[PDB]
Write an enzyme that holds these catalytic residues in place. Structure first.
Site, PDB file in Angstrom:
ATOM      1  N   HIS E 147       0.754  -1.250   0.000  1.00 33.63           N
ATOM      2  CA  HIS E 147       0.000   0.000   0.000  1.00 33.63           C
ATOM      3  C   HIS E 147       0.782   1.297   0.000  1.00 33.63           C
ATOM      4  O   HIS E 147       0.240   2.334  -0.346  1.00 33.63           O
ATOM      5  CB  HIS E 147      -0.963   0.011   1.168  1.00 33.63           C
ATOM      6  CG  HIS E 147      -2.046  -1.005   1.054  1.00 33.63           C
ATOM      7  ND1 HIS E 147      -3.057  -1.119   1.981  1.00 33.63           N
ATOM      8  CD2 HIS E 147      -2.296  -1.936   0.107  1.00 33.63           C
ATOM      9  CE1 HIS E 147      -3.886  -2.077   1.609  1.00 33.63           C
ATOM     10  NE2 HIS E 147      -3.447  -2.589   0.474  1.00 33.63           N
ATOM     11  N   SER E 151      -0.229  -0.439  -6.642  1.00 31.33           N
ATOM     12  CA  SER E 151      -0.105  -1.852  -6.930  1.00 31.33           C
ATOM     13  C   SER E 151       0.538  -1.773  -8.315  1.00 31.33           C
ATOM     14  O   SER E 151       0.251  -0.847  -9.064  1.00 31.33           O
ATOM     15  CB  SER E 151      -1.493  -2.493  -6.996  1.00 31.33           C
ATOM     16  OG  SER E 151      -1.414  -3.912  -6.978  1.00 31.33           O
ATOM     17  N   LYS E 173     -14.122  -8.878  -8.842  1.00 32.60           N
ATOM     18  CA  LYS E 173     -13.092  -9.557  -9.613  1.00 32.60           C
ATOM     19  C   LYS E 173     -12.464 -10.715  -8.829  1.00 32.60           C
ATOM     20  O   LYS E 173     -12.385 -11.824  -9.330  1.00 32.60           O
ATOM     21  CB  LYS E 173     -12.024  -8.529  -9.996  1.00 32.60           C
ATOM     22  CG  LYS E 173     -10.773  -9.070 -10.633  1.00 32.60           C
ATOM     23  CD  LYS E 173     -10.945  -9.416 -12.083  1.00 32.60           C
ATOM     24  CE  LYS E 173      -9.612  -9.821 -12.647  1.00 32.60           C
ATOM     25  NZ  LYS E 173      -8.596  -8.779 -12.321  1.00 32.60           N
ATOM     26  N   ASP E 174     -12.024 -10.456  -7.603  1.00 32.36           N
ATOM     27  CA  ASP E 174     -11.409 -11.486  -6.777  1.00 32.36           C
ATOM     28  C   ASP E 174     -12.351 -12.601  -6.350  1.00 32.36           C
ATOM     29  O   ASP E 174     -11.978 -13.769  -6.356  1.00 32.36           O
ATOM     30  CB  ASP E 174     -10.794 -10.855  -5.546  1.00 32.36           C
ATOM     31  CG  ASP E 174      -9.722  -9.875  -5.899  1.00 32.36           C
ATOM     32  OD1 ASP E 174      -9.546  -9.644  -7.110  1.00 32.36           O
ATOM     33  OD2 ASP E 174      -9.059  -9.333  -4.986  1.00 32.36           O
ATOM     34  N   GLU E 217       6.756 -33.646   0.399  1.00 28.03           N
ATOM     35  CA  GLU E 217       5.606 -33.325  -0.448  1.00 28.03           C
ATOM     36  C   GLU E 217       6.024 -32.655  -1.746  1.00 28.03           C
ATOM     37  O   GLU E 217       7.061 -31.987  -1.803  1.00 28.03           O
ATOM     38  CB  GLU E 217       4.627 -32.426   0.302  1.00 28.03           C
ATOM     39  CG  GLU E 217       3.864 -33.115   1.396  1.00 28.03           C
ATOM     40  CD  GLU E 217       2.970 -34.195   0.850  1.00 28.03           C
ATOM     41  OE1 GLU E 217       1.978 -33.886   0.156  1.00 28.03           O
ATOM     42  OE2 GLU E 217       3.276 -35.373   1.104  1.00 28.03           O
TER      43      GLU E 217
HETATM   44  C1  HEM Z   1       0.921 -16.188   2.391  1.00 30.33           C
HETATM   45  C2  HEM Z   1       1.617 -15.069   1.976  1.00 30.33           C
HETATM   46  C3  HEM Z   1       1.204 -14.159   0.993  1.00 30.33           C
HETATM   47  C4  HEM Z   1      -0.012 -13.513   0.899  1.00 30.33           C
HETATM   48  C5  HEM Z   1      -1.329 -13.820   1.613  1.00 30.33           C
HETATM   49  C6  HEM Z   1       0.266 -12.411   0.030  1.00 30.33           C
HETATM   50  C7  HEM Z   1      -0.655 -11.497  -0.209  1.00 30.33           C
HETATM   51  C8  HEM Z   1      -0.537 -10.511  -1.125  1.00 30.33           C
HETATM   52  C9  HEM Z   1      -1.597  -9.576  -1.411  1.00 30.33           C
HETATM   53  C10 HEM Z   1      -2.933  -9.435  -0.662  1.00 30.33           C
HETATM   54  C11 HEM Z   1      -1.200  -8.913  -2.504  1.00 30.33           C
HETATM   55  C12 HEM Z   1      -2.050  -8.040  -3.438  1.00 30.33           C
HETATM   56  C13 HEM Z   1      -2.569  -8.501  -4.824  1.00 30.33           C
HETATM   57  C14 HEM Z   1      -1.466  -8.878  -5.806  1.00 30.33           C
HETATM   58  O1  HEM Z   1      -0.736  -7.965  -6.270  1.00 30.33           O
HETATM   59  O2  HEM Z   1      -1.331 -10.086  -6.107  1.00 30.33           O
HETATM   60  C15 HEM Z   1       0.172  -9.238  -2.568  1.00 30.33           C
HETATM   61  C16 HEM Z   1       0.995  -8.592  -3.324  1.00 30.33           C
HETATM   62  C17 HEM Z   1       2.261  -8.908  -3.541  1.00 30.33           C
HETATM   63  N1  HEM Z   1       2.864  -9.988  -2.977  1.00 30.33           N
HETATM   64 FE1  HEM Z   1       2.239 -11.196  -1.840  1.00 30.33          FE
HETATM   65  N2  HEM Z   1       1.497 -12.414  -0.584  1.00 30.33           N
HETATM   66  C18 HEM Z   1       2.038 -13.584  -0.069  1.00 30.33           C
HETATM   67  C19 HEM Z   1       3.264 -14.076  -0.457  1.00 30.33           C
HETATM   68  C20 HEM Z   1       4.127 -13.388  -1.295  1.00 30.33           C
HETATM   69  C21 HEM Z   1       5.407 -13.885  -1.762  1.00 30.33           C
HETATM   70  C22 HEM Z   1       6.089 -15.204  -1.443  1.00 30.33           C
HETATM   71  C23 HEM Z   1       5.973 -12.890  -2.450  1.00 30.33           C
HETATM   72  C24 HEM Z   1       7.324 -12.783  -2.776  1.00 30.33           C
HETATM   73  C25 HEM Z   1       8.179 -13.659  -3.447  1.00 30.33           C
HETATM   74  C26 HEM Z   1       4.950 -11.886  -2.573  1.00 30.33           C
HETATM   75  C27 HEM Z   1       5.068 -10.778  -3.335  1.00 30.33           C
HETATM   76  C28 HEM Z   1       4.106  -9.838  -3.525  1.00 30.33           C
HETATM   77  C29 HEM Z   1       4.266  -8.618  -4.304  1.00 30.33           C
HETATM   78  C30 HEM Z   1       5.465  -8.131  -5.039  1.00 30.33           C
HETATM   79  C31 HEM Z   1       3.040  -8.169  -4.495  1.00 30.33           C
HETATM   80  C32 HEM Z   1       2.495  -7.615  -5.797  1.00 30.33           C
HETATM   81  C33 HEM Z   1       2.725  -6.216  -6.305  1.00 30.33           C
HETATM   82  C34 HEM Z   1       2.184  -6.021  -7.705  1.00 30.33           C
HETATM   83  O3  HEM Z   1       2.716  -6.641  -8.641  1.00 30.33           O
HETATM   84  O4  HEM Z   1       1.217  -5.254  -7.866  1.00 30.33           O
HETATM   85  N3  HEM Z   1       3.816 -12.157  -1.870  1.00 30.33           N
HETATM   86  N4  HEM Z   1       0.586 -10.312  -1.868  1.00 30.33           N
END
Ligand code: HEM
Ligand SMILES: CCCCCCCC/C=C\CCCCCCCC(=O)OC[C@H](COP(=O)(O)OCCN)OC(=O)CCCCCCC/C=C\CCCCCCCC
Ligand SMILES: CCCCCCCC/C=C\CCCCCCCC(=O)OC[C@H](COP(=O)(O)OCCN)OC(=O)CCCCCCC/C=C\CCCCCCCC
Ligand code: HEM
Ligand code: HEM
Lengths: 49, 442, 100, 59, 271, 108, 55
Positions: E147, E151, E173-174, E217
């Site tokens: 945030h 995004s 959408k989600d 796994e």
């Molecule tokens: C269980 C853990 C995780 C949850 C629940 C989580 C959740 C989220 C959420 C709510 C978003 C927003 C929607 C989206 O852009 O897809 C987000 C964004 C992001 N997450 Fe995660 N994430 C998780 C794991 C990770 C991992 C492993 C990575 C890193 C390798 C990561 C990298 C990112 C980044 C870079 C953004 C997206 C920014 C964009 O491209 O707009 N997240 N994540």
């Protein structure tokens, strides 16, 4: 000057068949909202289940 | 009061063997104002005809064949009479204000215009560039472009969507002909009204008109009045953005019923409830018009206005606010909330005043001669006859709460609105949002 | 033997950022330099680019591109920011140097 | 004019909507189960105990 | 559940045969673990190729999310205490043994005392119960950092030009995505419950029978591979460790003057 | 920004809740219980977690799992004690915390 | 239903243990909300009169 500006045509292009000028949009849309809301009404419904 | 109304003289009306309707209100006033009001506007133009009626307005005064410019102007100025006029989308008019000692002279002048404009191929070409300029001035008045854009999208794809002045292309090229073509097609007795108010006595008027309006109908067309093609409303938006401006303008609205319809009174009463604001007021204590109060408490806007602009068979019931780049949202939020409140939980204490405020307008709607004439001119043209204050009274003197709700909700609730907004409007939420701002989570 | 010029043109059409209607420079990632750079850009260009960039996001939003005709041709791509972006970078390296 | 009748009577008022989401659910449940079970069981005639039952409960 | 060598395996079994809808709950949980990784893997992906990772802080925490989500899923599979649960725990944990010097003493403390036995099932159960809440905790930090900036988006160029209110749109959408992806989850969960589960893990753990082909796994395999790639036991662990930790380096290996790689056909095939 | 302690999304959270946070000067000693209550919690969760790592939740093993934890688990006895007694430190504090608020109208 | 089936027996020791393990984290969760709302206003003080005068 803004007077020089029109709204493009969504006619046919997007408008549902009950929408083409010289015919009140209103007589036909309580029917248009009825459908949509019905679809939503059904989802809330299916979801509750 | 009721007596004051009851003792208000009746408005004489009578059509000619021609078709023109001649009406008036005799008063006493040494002065008066008479003019003709045409059943013509931009609505009646074509994609290539549009602008004529306006190009036409700018020449109506510059002289007739019977008496060229230098003269017409000289003859009016010389008698201390005032000649002015306008043209909307469905309603044009030319009126003069003199000393009721000249009904006959005025009346003649009038006719000579709505019947013989010089249309000097040499004068035209001049006004052509005068408009193109005048038009570029109408432009920076973001208060008007906004309404135009509103109509544009509101009645997109229809005769109403076209602006009263017209495209620069049209103005740059309309022919000496087209103008004549526009005149001889719409300026006919059946659609025209000769109205007056002052020391003038009906008869002297009739005769005078019956004398200078020597029109004669042969076929049945001439004698009949053509009804226009209905105009389709469309829940849509149009956003002319430019953070370059000092502040933003917003206008949202639903389709209106149309003159003929009665509810236009209840609906007219509702708008009296939300009323209008303007930083030069003195009132963080403004009776209701919370929109205004709120607007003051939280500094929501520079001003706003509620309006029930209507036409022959349709209209626009909405509102328009001017606001700073940063308070656009709350303002819209708060306002749009009032419409709901308006038609979902209104109160008697409210409608009571609403009425009064209207009645006071309703009356000051006739303050002077020029304005009265405007009513007779209009009333006839759009309603069919004249509505006496004595009447408007009852009509809107019997609107209770439940009546406002029933109606407002009939025209506002869950309807797809038509918004328009020029200026720095990044903060104005998407359509979907303002859309679901049309139903209360009752 | 093989023109970089032949290549560059290959890649340009290969990349495809033109099917969206935007110039090469309309795609450079906005790091610190490009940010200063764009801020120096004349207003003519700024609004031009602004619209382009938005028109591209909208196509992309719709999963639809621009008709072949409107595709910016390699040889007509206008490097509107590179000149600026360049001074910014050497202006900086000058400072990155003096402060040592 | 169902759809239109529908809107007017059922989908216009936030109140009415919810109220038919419930009554609509009760009816959907009862009907959707029977139907499914039916479809299920029939695709499996003579296999379910409900079918083999009688042999041992007398029959 | 009961976390004790003598009740584990059956507590689970009992849960399935006795606890009303117990069977369904176990299934969802087990299969869910996978839905979880499939998603986390597509989540990484998207970021790797839209350069989402350029948002360093929001990306680094994400790596911490992955590590955490793993651990919680390794120590969680032992719980049912079946052959693989046990043997997997014994082989994978013993790995640290390579760490010179302070090695053996770690594993030897990590789990109970001398070998995966009761004292470790307990601490594993505990650990399993705790970590998920830490995931949620951190997941908050993740979204915070996110945030901070907007995004990112597919064309990798400033979105300010025209943003849209999340809710009216993306909420819908989600939720759509939720169902479109949740349907296979359930189809799998309800028709081929064991499709992705080793049968050998239906035999109560027994220290006198090492199964052939001991493997963690699926969502761990890729690394299990890179682990047995280099012979020198030590280096092997390092390869393993680096197979995931490399993610921390990605942001320093970005050279393109462009963020995403939409307009980068070459690297596109590389991807 | 300069401070780099008031700009960072996370530190800014801390530097705004345990530093730079405007507190009245005349705060009484009764205000020391929110603090305690919090650390009281960190403590429980810790000792507890560490204690749960040796417990078995089953009619036939519960009582002894605890006993075993005390007789066998190194420093197990201490951990149990702290956790048990801690429960009380916890309530004594939460009760003095209520009090202070009840009579300084903190509840407003 | 609260406890196991018919009387405090095994099926409830378990759910109690679980519950015990869970709730504390919920306490911490809420404890955050507590301090949030607090921080909205200042902290109250013994003389019960505006502290702004000198924090
Ligand atoms: C269980 C853990 C995780 C949850 C629940 C989580 C959740 C989220 C959420 C709510 C978003 C927003 C929607 C989206 O852009 O897809 C987000 C964004 C992001 N997450 Fe995660 N994430 C998780 C794991 C990770 C991992 C492993 C990575 C890193 C390798 C990561 C990298 C990112 C980044 C870079 C953004 C997206 C920014 C964009 O491209 O707009 N997240 N994540
Ligand atoms: C069997 C009998 C069961 C009965 C038990 C009781 C529960 C009764 C139901 C109470 C719900 C009443 C619904 C109130 C909500 C309606 C609403 O106010 O807003 C609608 C609203 C907006 O649509 P509009 O068309 O704009 O509505 C305009 C209306 N004039 O928002 C609604 O989406 C969201 C509706 C749900 C649909 C999306 C589905 C989400 C579900 C995800 C799939 C997962 C399910 C599986 C497990 C869940 C655990
Ligand atoms: C480790 C465990 C690995 C194994 C897990 C298995 C999952 C199997 C992979 C299935 C892949 C489905 C891909 C369908 C792709 C469709 C497509 O070809 O087009 C590609 C496409 C569109 O191109 P644009 O240029 O944006 O379009 C312009 C905008 N309109 O977008 C796709 O990126 C995003 C693809 C994400 C790939 C999914 C890969 C997940 C695995 C990689 C994680 C790697 C990181 C390193 C270590 C892992 C720990
Ligand atoms: C385990 C839970 C609790 C913790 C960790 C907690 C923590 C805190 C903290 C950190 C403070 C700040 C210092 C202070 O003013 O004492 C605080 C303030 C406060 N807490 Fe709690 N609290 C807890 C329970 C409660 C309870 C039960 C009540 C309510 C009956 C309560 C009422 C307040 C109020 C009113 C303030 C003080 C405002 C003032 O007088 O300045 N707290 N609490
Ligand atoms: C909110 C803080 C906590 C409170 C108020 C609390 C209170 C208690 C109480 C009253 C006991 C009984 C001690 C006795 O036998 O005399 C206890 C036992 C226990 N608690 Fe907690 N507890 C808390 C948190 C935790 C947590 C989060 C864990 C670990 C995850 C935990 C795990 C246990 C275990 C395993 C026992 C059984 C062992 C024993 O009783 O000696 N406790 N706790």
């Amino acid at each position: 000057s803004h007077t020089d500006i029109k709204v493009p045509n969504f006619s046919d292009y997007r408008r549902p068949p009950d929408d083409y000028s010289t015919k009140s949009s209103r007589e036909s849309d309580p029917s248009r909202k009825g459908f949509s809301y019905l679809v939503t009404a059904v989802t809330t419904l299916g979801v509750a289940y | 009061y009721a007596q004051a109304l009851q003792s208000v003289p009746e408005t004489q009306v009578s059509q000619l063997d021609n078709g023109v309707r001649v009406a008036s209100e005799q008063s006493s006033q040494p002065t008066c104002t008479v003019g003709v009001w045409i059943d013509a506007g931009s609505r009646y133009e074509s994609e290539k005809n549009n602008g004529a009626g306006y190009f036409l307005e700018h020449l109506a005064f510059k002289g007739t064949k019977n008496r060229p410019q230098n003269a017409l102007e000289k003859e009016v100025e010389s008698m201390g009479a005032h000649l002015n006029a306008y043209s909307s989308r469905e309603h044009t008019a030319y009126y003069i204000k003199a000393l009721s000692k000249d009904v006959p002279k005025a009346v003649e002048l009038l006719a000579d215009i709505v019947q013989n404009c010089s249309l000097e191929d040499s004068q035209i070409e001049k006004e052509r560039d005068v408009i193109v300029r005048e038009l570029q001035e109408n432009d920076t008045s973001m208060r008007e472009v906004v309404f135009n854009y509103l109509h544009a999208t509101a009645f997109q794809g229809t005769g109403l969507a076209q602006s009263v002045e017209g495209p620069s292309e049209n103005i740059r090229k309309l022919s000496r002909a087209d103008l004549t073509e526009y005149l001889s097609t719409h300026y006919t007795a059946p659609r025209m009204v000769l109205a007056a108010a002052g020391g003038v006595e009906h008869q002297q008027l009739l005769e005078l008109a019956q004398k200078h309006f020597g029109g004669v109908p042969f076929t049945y067309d001439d004698d009949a009045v053509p009804t226009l093609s209905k105009c389709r409303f469309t829940g849509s938006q149009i956003r002319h953005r430019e953070d370059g401006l000092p502040l933003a303008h917003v206008a949202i609205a639903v389709e209106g019923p149309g003159w003929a319809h009665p509810d236009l009174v209840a609906l007219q009463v509702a708008n009296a409830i939300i009323g209008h604001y303007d930083r030069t007021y003195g009132g963080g204590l403004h009776s209701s018009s919370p929109l205004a109060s709120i607007a003051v408490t939280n500094k929501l806007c520079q001003s706003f206005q509620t309006f029930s602009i209507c036409y022959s068979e349709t209209g626009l019931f909405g509102f328009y606010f001017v606001c700073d780049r940063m308070s656009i949202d709350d303002m819209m939020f708060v306002l749009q909330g009032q419409w709901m409140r308006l038609c979902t939980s209104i109160s008697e204490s409210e409608v009571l005043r609403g009425k009064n405020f209207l009645r006071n307008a309703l009356v000051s709607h006739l303050d002077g001669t020029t304005p009265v004439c405007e009513d007779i001119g209009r009333e006839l043209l759009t309603y069919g006859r004249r509505i006496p204050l004595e009447e408007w009274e009852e009509r809107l003197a019997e609107v209770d709460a439940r009546m406002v709700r029933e109606v407002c909700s009939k025209y506002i609730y869950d309807q797809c609105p038509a918004v328009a907004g020029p200026g720095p409007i990044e903060q104005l939420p998407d359509y979907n949002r303002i859309r679901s701002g049309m139903f209360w989570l009752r | 033997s093989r023109w970089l010029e032949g290549i560059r043109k290959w890649y340009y059409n290969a990349a495809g950022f033109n099917k969206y209607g935007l110039m090469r420079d309309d795609t450079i990632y906005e790091n610190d330099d490009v940010k200063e750079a764009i801020r120096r850009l004349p207003e003519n260009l700024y609004d031009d680019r602004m619209f382009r960039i938005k028109r591209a996001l909208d196509l992309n939003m719709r999963q639809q591109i621009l008709p072949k005709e409107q595709w910016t041709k390699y040889e007509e791509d206008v490097p509107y920011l590179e000149p600026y972006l360049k001074e910014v970078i050497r202006e900086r390296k000058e400072r990155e140097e003096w402060d040592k | 004019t169902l759809t239109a009748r529908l809107y007017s009577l059922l989908f216009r008022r936030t109140s009415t909507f919810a109220l038919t989401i419930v009554v609509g659910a009760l009816l959907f449940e009862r009907a959707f189960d029977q139907g499914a079970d039916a479809i299920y069981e029939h695709i499996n005639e003579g296999k379910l105990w409900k079918h083999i039952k009688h042999k041992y409960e007398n029959k | 559940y009961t976390a004790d060598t003598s009740l584990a395996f059956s507590s689970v079994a009992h849960t399935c045969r006795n606890v009303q809808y117990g069977w369904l709950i176990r299934n969802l949980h087990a299969n869910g673990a996978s839905f979880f990784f499939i998603c986390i893997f597509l989540h990484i992906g998207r970021g790797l190729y839209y350069g989402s990772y350029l948002y360093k802080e929001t990306w680094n925490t994400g790596v911490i999310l992955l590590l955490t989500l793993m651990a919680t899923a390794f120590v969680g599979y032992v719980l049912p205490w079946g052959q693989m649960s046990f043997w997997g725990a014994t082989v994978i944990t013993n790995l640290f043994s390579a760490i010179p010097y302070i090695g053996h003493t770690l594993v030897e403390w990590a789990w109970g005392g001398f070998s995966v036995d009761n004292p470790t099932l307990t601490r594993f159960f505990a650990l399993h119960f705790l970590l998920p809440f830490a995931i949620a905790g951190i997941t908050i930090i993740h979204l915070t950092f996110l945030h901070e900036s907007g995004s990112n988006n597919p064309l990798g160029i400033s979105s300010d030009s025209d943003k849209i209110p999340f809710h009216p749109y993306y909420s819908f959408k989600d939720i759509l995505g939720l169902t479109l992806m949740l349907t296979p989850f359930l189809t799998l969960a309800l028709f081929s419950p064991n499709l992705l589960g080793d049968p050998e893990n239906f035999t109560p753990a027994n220290p006198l029978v090492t199964p052939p082909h001991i493997k963690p796994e699926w969502y761990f395999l890729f690394a299990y591979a890179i682990l047995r790639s280099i012979p020198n036991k030590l280096g092997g662990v390092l390869a393993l460790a680096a197979s995931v930790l490399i993610l921390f380096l990605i942001p320093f290996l970005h050279k393109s003057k462009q963020r995403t790689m939409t307009f980068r056909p070459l690297s596109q095939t590389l991807f | 920004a300069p401070n780099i302690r008031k700009s960072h999304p996370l530190l800014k959270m801390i530097n705004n809740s345990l530093i730079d946070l405007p507190a009245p000067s005349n705060i009484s000693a009764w205000w020391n219980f929110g603090s305690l209550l919090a650390v009281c919690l960190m403590t429980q969760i810790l000792t507890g977690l560490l204690l749960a790592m040796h417990y078995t939740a089953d009619t036939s093993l519960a009582f002894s799992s605890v006993a075993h934890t005390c007789r066998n688990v190194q420093y197990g006895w201490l951990i149990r004690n702290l956790h048990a007694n801690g429960a009380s430190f916890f309530f004594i504090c939460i009760f003095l915390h209520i009090g202070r608020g009840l009579y300084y109208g903190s509840y407003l």
